[PDB]
C-alpha cells in the first residue's frame, strides 16, 4: 500500500490496477471541480507492457503535454 | 441723482451683459466615460482568479451575498 491517498492531490484522482500477469496502468484523471477548464476531464496514463517496458500517454493538447510523453 | 450717472450705469450694465460662454458638454460626456471604465475594469481580476482557481463559470455573479468555496 503506497503511502498516498487516491485524492491526495486536489487537482485530480489517481487509479492503479496491476494485473496478475504484471501488466498494468497507473492513470491520473483531472477533476472538473478543481482543475482548469482546458485540463478538465483529461487523463494521463503510464502503462507497463507484459515483457516489462514502461510507456506513457495523455489526452491533453500538444502544447500542454509535458516533455516526456506523446498524445 | 442726475441723468449722467443713470445713463452711465445703464451703459455699463449692457456692456457687462456681453460675456461669451463656450461649450461645456463634451467635458461631462468624457468624464462619464472616464469613470465608467475605471469602475468596471477591475472585475477582470476577479474573473481571471475565479476561472484559474478551479470553479467554473456561470456561478460568477454580482452583488453582496458573501462568498464560499464554490461560488464567487
Could you describe the 3D structure shown?
This is part of a larger assembly, with two copies of chain A. The first copy, chain A, is mostly beta strands. Chain A contains no helices and four strands. The first copy, chain A, has a four-stranded antiparallel sheet with strand order 1-2-3-4, with no helix packed on it. The first copy, chain A, is flat, with a radius of gyration of 13 Å. Chain A starts with 11 loop residues before the first strand and ends in a 13-residue tail after the last strand. The A-B interface holds A 32-37 and B 51-52, 54-56.
What's the arrangement of secondary structure elements?
This is part of a larger assembly, with two copies of chain A.
Chain A: E1 12-18, E2 24-30, E3 43-48, E4 54-58
Antiparallel strand pairs in A: 1-2, 2-3, 3-4
Keywords:
part of a larger assembly; 2 chains; mainly beta; 4-stranded antiparallel sheet; 0% helix
